[PDB]
Amino acid sequence: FHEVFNATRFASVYAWNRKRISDYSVLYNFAPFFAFKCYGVSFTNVYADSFVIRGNEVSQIAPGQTGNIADYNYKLPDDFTGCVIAWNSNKLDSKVSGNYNYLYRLFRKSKLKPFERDISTEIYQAGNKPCNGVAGFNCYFPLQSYGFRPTYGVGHQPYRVVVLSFE
Amino acid sequence: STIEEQAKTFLDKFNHEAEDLFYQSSLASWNYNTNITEENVQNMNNAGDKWSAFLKEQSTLAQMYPLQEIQNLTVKLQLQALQQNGSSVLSEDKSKRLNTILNTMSTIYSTGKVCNPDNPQECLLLEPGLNEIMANSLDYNERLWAWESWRSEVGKQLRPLYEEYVVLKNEMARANHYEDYGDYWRGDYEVNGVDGYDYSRGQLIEDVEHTFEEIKPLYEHLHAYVRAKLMNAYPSYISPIGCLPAHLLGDMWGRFWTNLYSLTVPFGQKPNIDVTDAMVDQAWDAQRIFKEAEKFFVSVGLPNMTQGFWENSMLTDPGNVQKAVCHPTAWDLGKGDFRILMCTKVTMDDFLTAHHEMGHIQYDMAYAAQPFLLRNGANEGFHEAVGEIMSLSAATPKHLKSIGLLSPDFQEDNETEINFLLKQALTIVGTLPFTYMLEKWRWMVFKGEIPKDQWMKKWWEMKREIVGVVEPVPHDETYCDPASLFHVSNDYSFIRYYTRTLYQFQFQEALCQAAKHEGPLHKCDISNSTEAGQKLFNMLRLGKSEPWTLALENVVGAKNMNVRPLLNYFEPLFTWLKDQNKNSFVGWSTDWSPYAD
Ligand SMILES: *[C@@H]1O[C@H](CO)[C@@H](O[C@@H]2O[C@H](CO)[C@@H](O)[C@H](O)[C@H]2NC(C)=O)[C@H](O)[C@H]1NC(C)=O
Ligand SMILES: *[C@@H]1O[C@H](CO)[C@@H](O[C@@H]2O[C@H](CO)[C@@H](O)[C@H](O)[C@H]2NC(C)=O)[C@H](O)[C@H]1NC(C)=O
Ligand SMILES: *[C@@H]1O[C@H](CO)[C@@H](O[C@@H]2O[C@H](CO)[C@@H](O)[C@H](O)[C@H]2NC(C)=O)[C@H](O)[C@H]1NC(C)=O
Ligand SMILES: *[C@@H]1O[C@H](CO)[C@@H](O[C@@H]2O[C@H](CO)[C@@H](O)[C@H](O)[C@H]2NC(C)=O)[C@H](O)[C@H]1NC(C)=O
Ligand SMILES: *[C@@H]1O[C@H](CO)[C@@H](O[C@@H]2O[C@H](CO)[C@@H](O)[C@H](O)[C@H]2NC(C)=O)[C@H](O)[C@H]1NC(C)=O
Ligand SMILES: *[C@@H]1O[C@H](CO)[C@@H](O[C@@H]2O[C@H](CO)[C@@H](O)[C@H](O)[C@H]2NC(C)=O)[C@H](O)[C@H]1NC(C)=O
Ligand SMILES: *[C@@H]1O[C@H](CO)[C@@H](O)[C@H](O)[C@H]1NC(C)=O
């Protein structure tokens, strides 16, 4: 666990890593863990999904939620049986002059079904005339960036999130 | 797909990009203001120019969505706030000329100076030295010299510039379907398409002229009292049935009568409440003040401070070399970054400015969830009114005696409350006729009802019959007396200062009814009551997403501004004045002039 919890670089929201490996009292012994909730329980395989999102969006990593994260980026099934933890990382993932290395998708033609990933980056068409792979009027680039900075109020600061799914 | 989905999809991207760019520009401007360096000026100007360029690009991009087929009111509000052209409908020639004359008027007002008749090498500016003479002097001849010279030396340079500023602004407004510039200015209070809360642009004039005819009975008694008190400091210069000379009113234009309090104090042997020694003997520093302000604000049910407010703010004057602009303001940088910039002393007026600025900060914190374009007060007069009611409620003896700055017994008498109410009326009531008259003159000048050969004539007749103030020297059509004021030569609207004074007392009288107050209104304190906090937060959290006629109703219960709460506030002073003017002549005559003999 000390490799998916200590990774020096985490993945963006729209392309989130999913680590599968073959001691729970160690994670329970660490930093304050701003959010820590597991709904179904207090296994054949374990899954560890990890990413970096904003503060006020940590409320969307939960079964039965809506928004721009639980719709287009990461959707959890309503029959969830894992446990989601999230902690602040303002002193690591935030830089003066912006940390534009973390992106997320805010335009998509359909919502995501649970545990699906989508990394394609074609131009989103909002109107009725074809776009032909070039931005402009009613054609948009679907991936935008967090402008993370240290002088941000909580809820607008970077939060590292790890979901541990159990079968 | 219809037209509305495309509008929402455009507004999402705009919201995100504009939020980021605005945060960058605001942080640059804060870094310049808190630490003055000439490289910070360039670091700020770069971000400012790039933000303005992004804004103009997105504005010319948002024109391709017709406003007559958007059916949502939020989307329509945002698109209509973004689609407006403002300037740039003029040619490059005319826009260049307009910017040139605006800059010229600004620098003429900023760097104009007058000097003595007996020593021409002693020239004084307006800011350090003219409004010091006009504020501290009791010499009739010195005040007359300053008043006349400021208008005859700077006021005569601004007339030929104003005469074409009027025309340029008028065609700029006509190019945007507004019929004049005054209508463009009144277009802030307009509400459309709500079917019950509407408000026209021509109804503001009627509602402003209707509320002023109820304030006249109090302003007339205040005028008579002030005149009968000035007849003892300037004998043989004031007539007991006439107007007041324009240079004896406390400042350069007569906008505030607050500097006449030393001459017209009711009972000079009862000192006003002033908790300054009790703070310095208890060693209150520049941060205990803000702790007390935050405690007062959380007492009524409002949230705490942001925990980033304490490290990033500037609550004390900076050190030896970090020269900064010391002007108490509240900054709303964005992304949850609220700050306060003021170089506080240990006084009683900084103790009130703290509450004012923290009320501003609480308002900014309330509507932080609205879209980027709907983050402002319901109109121009809501923000300062919300900031002012806190400073009103934080200066009552019931509050200071509970904080600990006054003795635990401190029996208060009625003479002290008369002193307090007169000091308040000299700055609250003494500025409503002036504001109303100035804005009426500007409206009529822009409309075309006053030909350019009758500006000074109409100005002084309106000053005589409305304000009750007479000029000490005849002024022909080569002067420009209004343009010698800051807001006129800098292109600012002046009606916000009128509606704010009414919204303030409406809010106060609506919140003192929820806190279960029983005595007079000028003694009310809303602290320790959560009903007032809830009633106010129900309005603070809306921003511009609702018409102002609905936000106003959420608190008060009416739809338009009323003037009865102000008279209910000043009733004891009104009774006392009515009893003091049994022998004087309440009113003035519009024929007496100081030079008429
Ligand atoms: C995460 O990694 C850091 C460093 O990569 C760990 O910090 C170490 O903590 C031990 C325990 O005292 C020290 O002996 C080491 O010197 C620390 N490392 C460094 C580089 O100073 C931290 O313990 C790790 N946390 C988890 C949960 O694995
Ligand atoms: C106020 O501004 C000045 C000028 O920008 C700053 O002075 C320099 O700041 C840079 C940025 O950290 C330093 O690398 C230099 O060593 C500073 N030089 C001098 C002579 O001061 C100054 O630091 C700013 N004030 C604060 C508190 O940061
Ligand atoms: C278009 O109008 C509708 C209602 O007229 C708005 O719907 C509201 O949306 C917010 C946030 O999604 C909800 O909290 C409200 O409950 C919705 N209203 C109702 C009555 O359910 C919608 O937001 C408007 N469009 C935009 C872009 O704001
Ligand atoms: C803003 O100014 C422009 C020109 O400066 C006005 O003209 C319209 O601009 C749009 C956007 O390019 C064109 O699609 C129209 O064909 C132009 N002519 C019209 C509408 O007659 C525009 O009307 C102005 N908008 C407002 C709200 O005043
Ligand atoms: C608001 O209410 C609180 C609590 O009722 C007041 O605080 C108490 O005031 C009494 C009387 O002055 C003291 O004996 C207590 O010691 C105080 N307790 C605390 C925790 O301060 C407070 O004075 C009230 N404030 C106002 C402005 O009425
Ligand atoms: C302040 O209150 C005192 C006490 O009520 C007032 O003194 C009385 O005033 C009335 C009015 O003329 C007299 O009839 C009484 O004889 C006065 N009392 C005494 C004991 O002589 C005083 O007038 C009030 N002052 C103001 C400005 O309202
Ligand atoms: C506000 O902060 C103080 C400490 O500064 C704390 O005692 C109080 O409980 C807080 N109130 C709220 C509503 O968070």
Author numbering:
A (entry chain E): 338 to 359, 364 to 383, 392 to 516
B (entry chain A): 19 to 615
What does the paper say about this structure?
The Omicron sub-lineages harbor multiple mutations in the S protein compared to the original strain (referred to as the WT strain), which mediates receptor recognition and facilitates membrane fusion with the host cells. Despite the extensive mutations, all these Omicron subvariants still utilize ACE2 as the host receptor. Binding of the receptor-binding domain (RBD) to the peptidase domain (PD) of ACE2 triggers conformational changes in the trimeric S protein, leading to exposure of the fusion peptide and facilitating membrane fusion with host cells. Hence, we characterized the ACE2-bound S protein structures derived from BF.7, BA.2.75, and XBB.1 subvariants.
To further analyze the RBD-PD interface in detail, we also determined the structures of monomeric RBDs (BA.2.75, BF.7, and XBB.1) bound to the ACE2-SIT1 complex. These structures provided improved resolution of the RBD-PD interface, avoiding the flexibility of RBD, and were resolved at local resolutions of 2.9, 3.2, and 3.6 Å, respectively. In comparison to the BA.2 subvariant, BA.2.75 exhibits additional mutations in the RBD, including D339H, G446S, N460K, and R493Q. Despite the presence of these numerous mutations in the subvariants, our structural analysis reveals a strikingly convergent binding pattern between the RBDs and ACE2. Of particular note is the single difference among BA.2.75, BF.7, and XBB.1: the substitution of Phe486 in BA.2.75 with Val in BF.7 and Ser in XBB. Additionally, the salt bridge formed by Arg493 of BA.2 with Glu35 of ACE2 is replaced by Gln493 in BA.2.75, BF.7, and XBB.1, reminiscent of the wild-type configuration. Overall, these mutations remodel the interaction network into a highly convergent mode, despite the presence of diverse mutations within the different subvariants. The monomeric human ACE2-PD exhibited binding to the RBDs of BA.2, BA.5, BA.2.75, BF.7, and XBB.1 with binding affinity (KD) of 4.80 ± 0.01, 3.2 ± 0.03, 1.2 ± 0.01, 4.1 ± 0.02, and 16.2 ± 0.03 nM, respectively. These values displayed heterogeneity compared to the WT RBD (12.5 ± 0.04 nM). However, despite these mutations, we have identified a convergent binding pattern between RBD and ACE2 in the BA.2.75, BF.7, and XBB.1 subvariants, suggesting ACE2 mimic monoclonal antibodies might have the most broad-spectrum neutralizing potency.
